[PDB]
Amino acid sequence: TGELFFRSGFGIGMRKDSPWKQQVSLSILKSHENGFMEDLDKTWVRYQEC
Amino acid sequence: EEYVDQVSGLSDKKFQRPNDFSPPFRFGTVPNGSTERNIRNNYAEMHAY
């Protein structure tokens, strides 16, 4: 019960300079724009037993 | 008695199956937009309906 506050999202960490950084930063956006994240959410989080 | 209204999301039977239920539900928006392009690239049948 209550209202949200200090709404900061998660993220994947990495070193200061690496191509994997930009690779993941693009792949996450692609997944979000595709629908994979919604499926993962509805599968592993959206239990809805009550 | 109050506050009785809730929907699940874009995977509900109301959006996926408009005809296989009560008289057909209605939902839409304006065309030529980012949301319209996204829902067309994601849900073809939903956009056609």
B11 in contact with chain A, both atoms CB, cutoff 8 A? yes
CA–CA gap between residue B8 and residue A46 (Å, rounded): 10
Q: What is the resolution of this structure in A?
A: 4.1
Residues with Cβ < 8 Å from B30, sequence gap 6 or more?
Answer: B36
Which method resolved this structure?
cryo-EM
A49 in contact with chain B, both atoms CB, cutoff 8 A? no
- Give how far the C-alpha of residue A15 lies from the chain's centroid of Cα atoms, to the nearest Å: 19
The total number of residues written for chain B in this structure: 49
CA triple A43-A48-A49, angle to 5 deg: 120
Annotated binding-site members of B for L-glutamate? 34-35
Structure tokens at A26: 């693009």
Please provide the DSSP assignment of A9-21 as one string: -------SS-HHH
User: Which chain B residues are Cβ-neighbours of A38 within 8 angstroms?
Assistant: 10
CA–CA gap between residue A8 and residue B39 (Å, rounded): 27
3-state secondary structure labels for all residues of chain B = CCCCCCCCCCCCHHHHCCCCCCCCCCCCCCCCCHHHHHHHHHCHHHHHC
User: Which chain A residues are Cβ-neighbours of B42 within 8 angstroms?
Assistant: 35
Check the CA dihedral A39-A45-A47-A50 and report its sign: negative
Distance spanning both ends of chain B, measured CA to CA: 35
